[PDB]
Design a protein around this ligand. Structure first.
Ligand SMILES: CC(C)=CCC/C(C)=C/CC/C(C)=C/COP(=O)(O)OP(=O)(O)O
Ligand SMILES: CC(C)=CCC/C(C)=C/CC/C(C)=C/COP(=O)(O)OP(=O)(O)O
Ligand SMILES: [Mg+2]
Ligand SMILES: [Mg+2]
Ligand SMILES: [Mg+2]
Ligand SMILES: [Mg+2]
Ligand SMILES: [Mg+2]
Ligand SMILES: [Mg+2]
Lengths: 510, 518
């Protein structure tokens, strides 16, 4: 009978060739040579764009950067000038690696009246223009016009593209730009698309497949441990909530997939699973009387009065307490800093955000609602925790600063809340206007906050890797998953399908 | 790790990462048939004693008890009367099963002066009388005489018996009687010994080896989980409590080995690993001021001030706190009752008892044996381990039930005192006013030999009370009844009056399967 991705008995069993580990190190070194070897600079950009989209950039970070720096120093410009595909790919890859390119590189493709209508048949160029547009910042208006233009022309030629790989790429891009997609879920999709390309490199393809299955094996061990944990909490047998742990994990794979960040991912997934559960306690099951004991226990970090809550509320509460204590403790053991005050504080702040939302049943300004809704979405919890677990030399002062939610963090948080609200009170709050115009306007705030995030990555930061990646990648996870959160019908089968292709079924090899 | 543990953890996880299962059910049904089949009554008692000693009673509880009741009802007594071996074995097996037999059955083996010296011509008889003596109660004078007589006669031949199996069994018995040995470690030893005896049943022996290996595979997965948890706490890198996790787990297997008690066994092993670690924090690391704050935080169950403790003290403290919360939460999730107040309470009681010992040590107080033992039956950690075991297993746990077990009814008190005194007796000539022998030496102005003899007499006395409590178990039921007795057997086995021997036991019982000729 069908292996069920929601069945915790099935999930608990995951993580039960050493041959093909050897071939991976060999193909890896072959792929390293390919990235370093001399190519035409366009062929080079396309090669490392390919490495990125196969989910392999984490394996070749030094070689990809040195490659991108080489192309940025290639002194002769004839190779991209007047070539729409090449201008747009060089723009995107350069901005992606923090090398500034001006929106003026797109001047030869437009005039005072805008982009030439003669570009409607350059599909590859239209698609590369489209993808590059989302690397733009606020006030970069040529980039804004490029998007609206490439979007219209691509929509018109859809279904009239002879190249199999190119037709698939256009359809995929118009649903979500590459810039908004997760690395790991994109990687599984692109392995299939790349294999149909004219210029496919069989050594890169073979290595893409082998690395993906090796990484997948790491994830399966993670899901087993997390499922055993979840069943050990008894929260899988709770009413009021849905999948919880497995959905939280699928998200966390969007936030971070690298085997070397496994422990942090598992903890993020746990916190994710508790946020969905307690959100439902506060937004559907708990009564007023119950939420104030729960909040109050959390504020004081004192479980003396826990036994005054009923089972179905007491269990979420004590699991939050015990997990927050465990993650705080991990910081002390591994990072030399007791993180319990930090985890207790992000839970106390998150419960207050939930307590304002429930008092309001008042009708706030979109500004007032987002001020609170960027906390209740639980990405301050998740991101402050991810920073506690990874920053070099954590201190109280550094944790007070990230928890103050400066722009870079605040922009990720608002983006997560807004993408969540687009995927069913952001629309209601804004709307003396209609739903259609409120939606369109929120979609606008998405575009705007992404420009703010993009620019932040160029701007002086106290932040480093991996937290920089965590803060952008939560938004991508939000883009990819919130579209399909309904829990039934088409959204459930698409989610199950992503789950099964990325977490369960390996890629057939040679 | 440095210093090196008995086994590396990566190896311990290696361990747990279909013919024989089907064969196990088939041999199990064949052994049921043997336990049920008509035998002469002495032969049936010998068979069910063999099943017990091979570690298999937990597979045949119904059949063994029904076989025992059948023999208790066998009308004609000619098969045991005037037979020392049969009288002894019948007495022991009956009492182990709650069927009273009076000490008076031994009177015919005595004359006016005591046990007849001619009984020394039958070593099997002497060994059965020795083993049976340990099922005695207070005021059963004839069972004390039997112990003294059998011990002396057997010792007059230990090491010089020209019959291999009996020689091994007598030597083994003189070290610890069967009654005081663990089930699981005895099973591994006796599988070897039984294979070498004259009356071996190869079906029973085959099943013993198969069931051993299957239970062992459950243990291997547990040690993998516990090793991952322990490395996760970082307590393996404390500069104390070398081998704390593996030793706790080895001891837990003596307290309870059954696969169906896996979760409880894992939690007990976690508490035992923390007791060893924190005992070290109190005895060989913390200052008085550090230990005051440790104790105060635990009393209040409030870790606000934890960061005032240095890392190597703070990490044990917070692991105690997190694990106690996890164990209490398991009782809520699984048993419907929030056990956090209970686990917090037994840790507070235990740390208060460590603080009292430390105060005596620093003030130069020389407690009486009675003052020492009142506190030291708590400091040994068995009130903690036992109350926790009761929380996790009792049907319908309540505050009133947990308060009762933590009030130390005689049964529990006897077990905790025994574990402490046995621990104190296992110490070599060593540099201590704060141990049983020395406390009694100070009290009575007694020598070390006389004091040790007195404490050995206390062990025999408390076992008599434990034995009698099982005939009136009162509020307790299985599995707590077995745990309360089996922690004492664990103590005898692990503190025999050291590294190589521990590693040998771990290797045969946990690491290496028994070779099957199958
Ligand atoms: C990276 C990671 C591990 C993430 C965990 C995924 C996750 C679902 C996080 C919390 C957000 C949430 C409650 C989504 C759906 O509930 P909702 O829309 O009902 O929430 P709301 O009531 O706040 O709108
Ligand atoms: C059932 C089970 C899982 C048992 C775990 C083993 C265990 C830790 C038992 C308690 C006794 C103890 C603390 C021994 C350590 O040596 P020590 O002699 O220093 O103890 P002391 O300082 O109190 O004398
Ligand atoms: Mg909500
Ligand atoms: Mg909700
Ligand atoms: Mg929502
Ligand atoms: Mg000690
Ligand atoms: Mg001590
Ligand atoms: Mg000791």
């Amino acid at each position: 009978y069908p292996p069920n991705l929601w069945d915790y008995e099935f999930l608990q069993s995951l993580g039960d060739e050493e041959k093909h580990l050897k071939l991976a190190d060999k193909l890896k070194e072959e792929v390293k040579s390919l990235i370093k070897q001399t190519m035409e600079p366009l062929t080079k950009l396309e090669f490392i764009d390919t490495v990125r989209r196969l989910g392999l950039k984490y394996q070749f970070e030094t070689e990809v950067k040195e490659a991108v720096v080489m192309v940025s120093k290639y002194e002769n410009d004839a190779w991209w000038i007047d070539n729409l595909h090449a201008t747009s790919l060089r723009f995107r890859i350069m901005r992606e690696n923090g090398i500034f390119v001006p929106q003026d590189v797109f001047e030869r493709f437009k005039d005072t009246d805008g982009f030439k209508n003669q570009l409607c048949e350059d599909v590859k160029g239209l698609l590369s223009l489209y993808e590059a547009s989302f690397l733009g910042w606020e006030g970069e208006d040529i980039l804004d016009e490029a998007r609206t233009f490439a979007t219209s022309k691509l929509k018109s030629i859809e279904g009239k593209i002879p190249s199999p790989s190119l037709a698939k790429k256009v359809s995929h891009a118009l649903d979500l730009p590459l810039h908004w997609r997760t690395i790991r879920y994109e990687a599984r999709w692109f392995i299939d698309t790349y294999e149909e390309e004219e210029d496919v490199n069989l050594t890169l393809l073979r290595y893409a497949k082998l690395d993906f299955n090796i990484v997948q094996s790491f994830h399966q061990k993670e899901i087993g441990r997390l499922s055993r944990w979840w069943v050990g909490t008894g929260l899988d047998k709770m009413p009021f909530a849905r999948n919880g742990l497995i959905q939280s994990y699928m998200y966390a794979i969007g936030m971070l997939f690298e085997p070397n960040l496994g422990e942090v991912r598992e903890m993020e997934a746990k916190v994710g699973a508790l946020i969905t559960t307690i959100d439902d306690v506060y937004d559907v099951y708990g009564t007023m009387e119950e939420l104030e004991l729960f909040t109050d226990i959390t504020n004081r970090w004192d479980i003396s009065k826990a036994d005054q809550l009923p089972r179905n509320i007491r269990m979420p509460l004590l699991t939050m307490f015990n997990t927050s204590n465990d993650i705080g403790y991990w910081a002390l053991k591994e990072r030399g800093f007791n993180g319990i005050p930090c985890t207790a504080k992000v839970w106390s702040d998150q419960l207050k955000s939930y307590t304002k939302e429930a008092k309001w049943f008042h009708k706030p300004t979109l500004e007032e609602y987002l001020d609170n809704a960027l906390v209740s979405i639980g990405f301050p919890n998740l991101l402050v925790t991810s920073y506690l677990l990874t920053v070099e030399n954590p201190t109280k002062e550094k944790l007070d600063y990230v928890n103050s939610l400066p722009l870079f963090v605040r922009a990720s948080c608002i983006l997560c809340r807004i993408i969540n609200d687009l995927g069913t009170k952001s629309i209601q709050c804004y709307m003396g206007a209609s739903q259609e115009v409120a939606r369109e306007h929120i979609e606008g705030l998405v575009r705007m906050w992404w420009k703010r995030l993009n620019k932040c990555l160029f701007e002086p930061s106290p932040f480093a890797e991996p937290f920089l990646s965590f803060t952008v990648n939560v938004v991508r996870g939000s883009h990819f998953f919130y579209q399909y959160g309904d829990g039934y019908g088409n959204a459930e089968s698409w989610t199950k399908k992503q789950g099964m292709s990325v977490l369960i079924h390996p890629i057939p090899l040679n």
